[PDB]
Write a protein that binds this ligand. Sequence first.
Ligand SMILES: CCCCCCCCCCCCCCCCCC(=O)OC[C@H](COP(=O)(O)OCCN)OC(=O)CCCCCCCCCCCCCCCCC
Ligand SMILES: CCCCCCCCCCCCCCCCCCCC
Lengths: 162, 54, 475, 131, 100
Amino acid sequence: MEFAFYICGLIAILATLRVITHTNPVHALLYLIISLLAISGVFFSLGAYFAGALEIIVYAGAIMVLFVFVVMMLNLGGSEIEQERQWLKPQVWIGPAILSAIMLVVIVYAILGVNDQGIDGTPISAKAVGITLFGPYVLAVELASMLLLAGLVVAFHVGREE
Amino acid sequence: LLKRDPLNSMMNIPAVLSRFAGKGLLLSENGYLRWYVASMSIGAVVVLALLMVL
Amino acid sequence: MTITPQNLIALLPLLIVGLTVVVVMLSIAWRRNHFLNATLSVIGLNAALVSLWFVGQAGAMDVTPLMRVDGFAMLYTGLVLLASLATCTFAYPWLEGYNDNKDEFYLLVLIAALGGILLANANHLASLFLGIELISLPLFGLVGYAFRQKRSLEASIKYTILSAAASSFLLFGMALVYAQSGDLSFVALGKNLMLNEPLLLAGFGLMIVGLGFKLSLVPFHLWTPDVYQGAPAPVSTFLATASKIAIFGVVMRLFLYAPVGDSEAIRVVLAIIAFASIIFGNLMALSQTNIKRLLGYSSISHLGYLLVALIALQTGEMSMEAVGVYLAGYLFSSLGAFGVVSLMSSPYRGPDADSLFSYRGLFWHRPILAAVMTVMMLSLAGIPMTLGFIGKFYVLAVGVQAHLWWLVGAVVVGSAIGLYYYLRVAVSLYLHAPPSNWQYSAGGIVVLISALLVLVLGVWPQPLISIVRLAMPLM
Amino acid sequence: STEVIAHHWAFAIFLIVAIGLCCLMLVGGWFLGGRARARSKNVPFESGIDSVGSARLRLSAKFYLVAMFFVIFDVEALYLFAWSTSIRESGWVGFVEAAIFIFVLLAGLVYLVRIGALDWTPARSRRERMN
Amino acid sequence: MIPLQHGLILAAILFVLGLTGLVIRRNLLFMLIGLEIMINASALAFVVAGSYWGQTDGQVMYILAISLAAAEASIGLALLLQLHRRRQNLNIDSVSEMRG
Ligand SMILES: CCCCCCCCCCCCCCCCCC(=O)OC[C@H](COP(=O)(O)OCCN)OC(=O)CCCCCCCCCCCCCCCCC
Ligand SMILES: CCCCCCCCCCCCCCCCCCCC
């Protein structure tokens, strides 16, 4: 359980770091797939089985759409790789590097002072999540339907041709 | 000596400081989205550090 | 707990706005009819506005762990419904010149109004998060509705990327708060505490990052003039009024109910943000030749004044009614100003009339719009005989009662800077410069009614005081 | 217990042996047999004549709108996945909630179909002219 | 016996990595990818917090989080399409003509 958690978290961290500092967009999407699979393994190690299943299920479809858009626009051989590699310089990354590092330092310092009894990893079932979702969280479900409707309408209005 | 009204200029000093500070602050609105994200991250760092020290 | 029929009665504006979303969308699917779909949207918004009376007759109670309906929720639901109705009224003569499909505008406005109502009733971290996104995403569509233009597409991309970043910040802060507390309800954020737990404070800081982005508070404010200028003018009206009002209302409710609202570190951080917001927003608007960017920096300063009223929430007892009176006055003044901008930009012809040279000499062809705009410039300046002064007076009284002398001095200094640029606009209206439809006349009637309300409630504010004092939440 | 850890070990060995068998067959295919040499062997196959350009191009798909809609509809599907495993516990009130959710879903689908958002066929392929 | 602090630290690391990717990348597609990493890290933090307390609310907040992520990715892809159609490039520094 902790074996799976630590190895999946390490794989997720390394794959995300590979994603944000990569030049090829298809390779970046593959590392994003690997990172999201690893985060799903982290979810499975914590007993959140439904969340891990949904993490693999809906991001496999979502990154497929990203691949569709990458094939539509970005992939050109070495032209987009040369253009993207020229966009990345030592100064351009070293600027926000300490900013992210000190944000992580402050957040980690705040984390380390909290009371922690440990996560026992007892599985919280999909049935319990469904009971809570359609119980105390009814308005969350209906207004989330309205939110996805708004996303549909915005995507239709913007992403058209003529 | 006084025909320029020196006290009026001394009291016009805060208006000049206001123009200068406003023109300096307008430099931050360069129009770049990545700078806006960076400024949000900077403000997050500042807010979190201020909450940690107090 | 379940949903009682009484809970359904308290859910009435949410139910009516959702039902009219579905009805308007099905009517669009049947046939594109700009007049009919605009009429159905405004009929649904008016039906929610008049169902507020039945919600008031029901009483104040909890609907699920997520929502709580009281007089405060009634007041902010009414504010966002008025803002949405005015936005639709301004949108019709603007959309009459739009060559592409116009019916989706009202759908997005209705879904954003639904998010505003949810934020009015929000009692939960889930409700607050969902209401924020339910406001933000239709505004991604609305800000980039005229995506064939440079500026609207730029503002859409900026608002979308930065609001996704702010949502991620707010969600991570919510997760840290939940990890500390174990409950997502507002009242339990600090019940188990000694109130300055580092993880609770860091979570509330990241939530402050997201919420201060949404409220254009310094230093999360740089998007505001860009998105205000780029967006269509009725979209700028909605984004300036309804989003700011709903998000500040849920921020007030969260800081009133959560035990960590009384923490000194959060109060000091909010005081720094309010001071910088007032001063910076007034200073940056000094040299603005664009009316939309000027109103964006103005919104930054006015949200700073509201933040000053929020800082003294735990100390005094006048802070919440101060925020109510201020938000009513700011809603009416912003409706008038942005509506004059919209009516001068109607019908849509590409780039809107947002330069100050366009409004220079407005009195010699549009005298009524010039009078409304100068009344709004006087009101946003906080000049007596206007409702904006009554709001500024409430903010000053609340700040003096809590001994927030730095914020009081900031309000005075920012008011003087505001006097400069607001009076510049108001007198440029009367210098010398080198429609014919009932919906345009309805927009003109809306800005004229806002101007008359601002004048009358600046002279005679007591009915607004009584209404806002009636709109009291559950202690 | 013991059956649970036995099934965990069985799942682990299943995955390991499956991936190892795939790798072993790939290695055996790679190393066995001879190799061909030709002047145009390392040219992509395009029916025997040289390409005009290459496969690295901005090839515009026509179903990209349907791809956005697919992402949205998959998230709606997971909401229904959560509901369907606990229907008896949620009762008729949960049924009313899911009926409203599904009706909003279907109204959005009807809206997308009716506005032509789901249509990307070219006009000469719409098969209008028939006997 | 996984500590709650370890899961929160992992989520924070993924969050700051996604934020760094959002800042340092000029391509709008990589910015959208960094935004996806950010929201997924926040959802992971909610899952960790829900698992520590033994509550379904962590996974419920996760579900709402990925619903927002899906709709946001949809809108961002539509806007990226418009940027590519009207600029022939995905450089986010090019869309900066509003300033001051
Ligand atoms: C062409 C078609 C046009 C259609 C009409 C459009 C314009 C008119 C809109 C009408 C809206 C009516 C809203 C009525 C709200 C109040 C209803 C009511 O009866 O409230 C009473 C209630 C306290 O009284 P009681 O019911 O006895 O409660 C005891 C315990 N529950 O009170 C409360 O609990 C609090 C009530 C106050 C809440 C705020 C008021 C509602 C929102 C107003 C927003 C605008 C305010 C600023 C403008 C003021 C102008 C003077
Ligand atoms: C062409 C426009 C490009 C804009 C790129 C913006 C990059 C901003 C990088 C900021 C890095 C800050 C590093 C830390 C500074 C010290 C802490 C914050 C200030 C007190």
